[PDB]
């Protein structure tokens, strides 16, 4: 199994006086930190969110972030003047790394303007997106003047991130392996006919996210299964909903095979009808 760190930023400038920057981090599927506009420190979300870092290490880091947020803000307002862009603006960053077995790691830092990719960090420098607008080339020019920022971003991605994600993995060890069994049941939705029925197979409360549901005729995979979106629960479990458009009654009698990981093999198969 693999657990990428993902640090997200959301920055929104309505006019040149009203603006907010909110952040958050995910280890794998679990959210581990968050950082809102009004708070001047970074909120931890798991007892083990500080990973393996000392309390003074964790401080000089929060300091780097604190100086970045404020400086990032002025710099955008100032690009707006130079590049002739009109408010409102919407910027997102997504930066992080992924530690691989046998000591290696890869990493990333992509930013997006009004919801489309515009640039990223590669090796030592900023680079434009394949097909980004003309002005983007000027922004890159101005970003690459700042030699100190470049080496800081580089140090953080190539060096600090990997060290932090290693700690988090052995310090949030038992939570990353936790397993939670689901409860499932069947029901009947709105008619898509006449004269045909709608079959719904609910699956609630499982964790981790990776799962597998289909509608079965014994051992026969009945495609035309429409699996919904895997939805979130407040307690960090997930909820699925798999449908089947059918002629009544062929079936009854049919089955829904749930293949989750705990359930170490002895999965749940339900038959039409029991409600």
């Amino acid at each position: 199994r693999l657990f990428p760190l993902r640090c997200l930023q959301i920055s929104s400038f309505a006019n040149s006086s009203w603006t907010r920057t909110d952040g958050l981090a995910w280890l794998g599927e679990l959210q581990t930190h968050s950082w809102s506009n009004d708070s001047d420190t970074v909120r931890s979300l798991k007892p083990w969110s500080q990973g393996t870092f000392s309390d003074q290490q964790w401080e000089t880091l929060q300091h780097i972030f604190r100086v970045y947020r404020s400086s990032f803000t002025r710099d955008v307002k100032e690009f707006a003047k130079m590049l002739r862009l009109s408010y409102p603006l919407e910027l997102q960053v997504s930066a992080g790394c992924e530690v691989h077995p046998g000591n290696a790691s890869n990493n990333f830092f992509h930013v997006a303007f009004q919801g489309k990719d515009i640039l990223s960090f590669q090796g030592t420098s900023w680079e434009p997106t394949q097909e980004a607008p003309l002005w983007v080339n000027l922004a890159i020019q101005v970003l690459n003047q700042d030699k100190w920022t470049r080496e800081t971003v580089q140090w953080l991605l190539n060096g600090t991130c990997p060290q932090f994600v290693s700690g988090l993995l052995e310090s949030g060890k038992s939570e990353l392996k936790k397993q939670v069994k689901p409860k499932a049941w069947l029901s009947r939705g709105p008619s898509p006919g006449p004269g045909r029925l709608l079959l719904v197979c609910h699956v609630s409360g499982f964790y981790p996210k990776p799962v597998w549901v289909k509608w079965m005729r014994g051992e026969q995979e009945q495609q035309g299964t429409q699996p919904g979106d895997i939805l979130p629960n407040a307690d960090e479990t997930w909820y699925l909903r798999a449908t089947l458009d059918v002629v009544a009654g062929e079936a009854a009698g049919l089955s829904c095979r749930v293949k989750h990981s705990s359930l170490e093999g002895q999965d749940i198969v339900l038959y039409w009808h029991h409600h």
Partner: T-cell receptor
Amino acid sequence: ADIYQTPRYLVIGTGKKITLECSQTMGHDKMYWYQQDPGMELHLIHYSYGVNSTEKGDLSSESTVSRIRTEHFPLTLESARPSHTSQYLCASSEFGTQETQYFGPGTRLLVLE
Amino acid sequence: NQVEQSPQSLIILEGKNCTLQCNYTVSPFSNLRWYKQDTGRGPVSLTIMTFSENTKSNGRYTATLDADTKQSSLHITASQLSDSASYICVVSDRGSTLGRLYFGRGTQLTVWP
């Protein structure tokens, strides 16, 4: 290739129209206008990132600038005033490893009744 | 004023050495520079340095930065009559054109024969 200002000095009646000329035959994109009352530090009144960008520093001055060619960045006062008396200094800057600023000879403006 | 200089003025005999002082509170600090302004003319940049520097040179002029205590100093060697001028200390808060510059009030140097 340097940076120039005309006129060196200027005496003018109040209420009339002043235009200080500044010219730059280096390649530079960025330029600034400073105002230096005597015995005081350089105060920044306008700057421009390049052609068509003209911004202000400070919330006060009643002067306007325009940038339509890279080489010209002229300062304008619509109706002169005693309060406008000062030295005015024009400058540009480049990169190619750190920034570097190049200043002009400046203009001595005196405004009378 | 986040940039402060000392002494206000001083007088030296020619051929003697001297040292001038600059103190700042600017944050973030990116870089700092010394400007020689002859009387009635425009400032001329002498040296620019960063924390990645600790020392710069340009003829008889040598500047040294201490980023920890937030202080720079300028040393002139074997002074000459042509050295008499106002020396201005200026600090920048970004390492790109995307930053403000802050101007000291400057020290007045007078060199006698």
